[PDB]
Every structure is written in structure tokens, then in C-alpha cells.
Amino acid sequence: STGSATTTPIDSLDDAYITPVQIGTPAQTLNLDFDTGSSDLWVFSSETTASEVDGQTIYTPSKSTTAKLLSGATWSISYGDGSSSSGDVYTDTVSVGGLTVTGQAVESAKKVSSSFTEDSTIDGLLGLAFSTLNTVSPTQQKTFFDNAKASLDSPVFTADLGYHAPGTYNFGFIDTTAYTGSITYTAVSTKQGFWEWTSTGYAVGSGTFKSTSIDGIADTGTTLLYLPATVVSAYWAQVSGAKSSSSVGGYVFPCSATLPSFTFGVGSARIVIPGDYIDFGPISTGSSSCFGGIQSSAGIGINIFGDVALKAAFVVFNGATTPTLGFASK
Numbered sequence: 001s002t003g004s005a006t007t008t009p010i011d012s013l014d015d016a017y018i019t020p021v022q023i024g025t026p027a028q029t030l031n032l033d034f035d036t037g038s039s040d041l042w043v044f045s046s047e048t049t050a051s052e053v054d055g056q057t058i059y060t061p062s063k064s065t066t067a068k069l070l071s072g073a074t075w076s077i078s079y080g081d082g083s084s085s086s087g088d089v090y091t092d093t094v095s096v097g098g099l100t101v102t103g104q105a106v107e108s109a110k111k112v113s114s115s116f117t118e119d120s121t122i123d124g125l126l127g128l129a130f131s132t133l134n135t136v137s138p139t140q141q142k143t144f145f146d147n148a149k150a151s152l153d154s155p156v157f158t159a160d161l162g163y164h165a166p167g168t169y170n171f172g173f174i175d176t177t178a179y180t181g182s183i184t185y186t187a188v189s190t191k192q193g194f195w196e197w198t199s200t201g202y203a204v205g206s207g208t209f210k211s212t213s214i215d216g217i218a219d220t221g222t223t224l225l226y227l228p229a230t231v232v233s234a235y236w237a238q239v240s241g242a243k244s245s246s247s248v249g250g251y252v253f254p255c256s257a258t259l260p261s262f263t264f265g266v267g268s269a270r271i272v273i274p275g276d277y278i279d280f281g282p283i284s285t286g287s288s289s290c291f292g293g294i295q296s297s298a299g300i301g302i303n304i305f306g307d308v309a310l311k312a313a314f315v316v317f318n319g320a321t322t323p324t325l326g327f328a329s330k
Helices: 144-151 229-236
Strands: 003-009 017-023 028-035 041-043 067-076 085-098 099-112 125-129 156-160 167-171 184-185 196-204 212-216 225-227 243-245 249-256 263-264 269-272 281-282 290-294 294-296 303-305 315-316 326-328
Touching: 003 085, 028 041, 041 085, 041 225, 067 099, 099 144, 184 196, 196 229, 212 225, 229 249, 249 294
Parallel strands: 028 125, 041 099, 212 303, 225 294
Antiparallel strands: 003 017, 003 167, 017 028, 017 085, 041 125, 067 085, 085 099, 156 167, 156 315, 184 326, 196 212, 196 263, 225 303, 243 249, 249 290, 263 269, 281 290, 315 326
16 A cells, blocks of 8 residues: 655745544544654644643544544653643544555644644644654554555655745655655664654855764654754854844844855765755844754754754655664655
């Protein structure tokens, strides 16, 4: 089997991407944030505290003839940005782009943090990291990909995120028309539960490539590119007027700037992030100070190849017995 679904930016800045997912019988379609940095499929629901729902589409398990309460199971997750959610668990039929899993754990939110409430466009998350990170207790549950994998034509999914445009998540096949050149594969460590890999270095604009190992995670659920302070300082030094602002919470730059590109290494290959991808717009409405898309990972404890990096590539998440990651230009 295979599946193919379009993923759409939630706003004009590509702050996140949502992908329609069918849950239950008859189908209830929710727009979920596909997150290769986490491993829970959770949704706003009929059980979510009423005051914490503001415009989201909810899953109502009582209206699904295939929903079953997973007795005694609860979940609770806290993300790196400080957001959180928790609740109980159903199993139900879940389909993405024509690919169907029966008996998928659907984690129904009883509580969500304010940041989720305040964003009407995201109805929940669909985790695509390794199932070892799944928070369901007392019986850990598998991701949608983990459940689908044996049925897939090939044990892979691909992320093809658009810049200011829709893109695609495919399951079970590699669309050879969706990238240019060849796909370069690189080793993955699953020891922290992430798609963790080591970049071979970077360049800023037209500058020379610096060969240096940068361990980090391929994370579709993080908006920006978080890298070591040395690397980030080297990038922003090429932008007149750019500075790190403790009050704003990162590097900002004059909105009048034309940003340089940023290149990262994948083995001997190179992925170029155009300068425009690094502009996240005014820090507040009407401001001429703009927020940068490359930020320091110092204090996070891990480097994160988020959407800013991934959207510059066609990315293969290879879930073979020894997982790997592939990157191609596009």
C-alpha cells in the first residue's frame, strides 16, 4: 500500500504545516501537524475542556462506530517550546492520503496548553518519530507509521514541504519526479527516539564550506533551524544590523535586509536554503525588526533541522530495520 497527502502552511510565514487526516467511521477529518520530532497522535476532541477549544475541529469518539476506549490508558506530553497536552486514549481507524491503519491509538485531549487553544488551525499532532517516545501509559502505543510499515510497498515516508506553498507527505514510496539530482542517504541514531543524524558542515551565502560535524534531528514539527551558537553567529554576521535580542528571544534583523542563503552538508552533498526562507517577518505587527529563521540551539541541548531546513529538500525517512535519512535538492 501507499498514501499521499498534501500538507499546507497554516499562515503566510510557514509557521507550521497541516495535513488532513481521516479518523473514525464515518470519517472525521482533522487537520494535524505531522511531527517527526514526537510520537503521539493526539487530537482536540469532545473531551477537551470547553474553554480550551477555540475554533479547532474536534474528534468525537462516540460518533465513530469503530472507536474503542483503550481502558486505563492516559497520555501527557510536554514539547520543547513549553506547550503541552494530555488526556485518554481510543483506538480507531485512521487514514492519511488513502493509507489506512486500523486500531491506531488516537489520543484524545482532555487538556491543552494555551498555545494550542490560541491556534485555531491545528486540530492535533501526528507523531512520526520513533515509537519509543510515545507517552501512552501504562502500555506504550505505536505511531501511525510504525503501524502502517509492514503494509507499505517500501518502509519509508517522505516530507516535501513547500516554501509559502503546499507540499506533500508520501507513505510507502519515493516519488522520483519530486526532486532533482540524486538522494544522498546518511546514518541515523535512534537512541534518543529521534531521526538524529550528523550534517557534514555549512556555508553562509557564497562563502566557503566549513567541514564540521553537526549532530541534530530532522524535525518537521519545529518551525526554525536551531544550530550551534558559533554557526548562527557566523550567519547573522553577514546581515547588516542583525543582533541577538534577549528581550525578543533570538536573532532579529532589519526587515529591509536581503538575507544570504545557508547551505548544510549531507555527506558530500549540499542543500541550499535560500535567504528568503530565513525571514519570519516583523517581531510584532508594524515593526521594522524581523525575526530570524536560524537561531541558536544553545540551551535546547540538541540541534534541530526544522522546517526552514527541511523545506529546502526532499527528505526520505527510511524506516528499514536500520533506519536512515535521505536528502535531495528539489
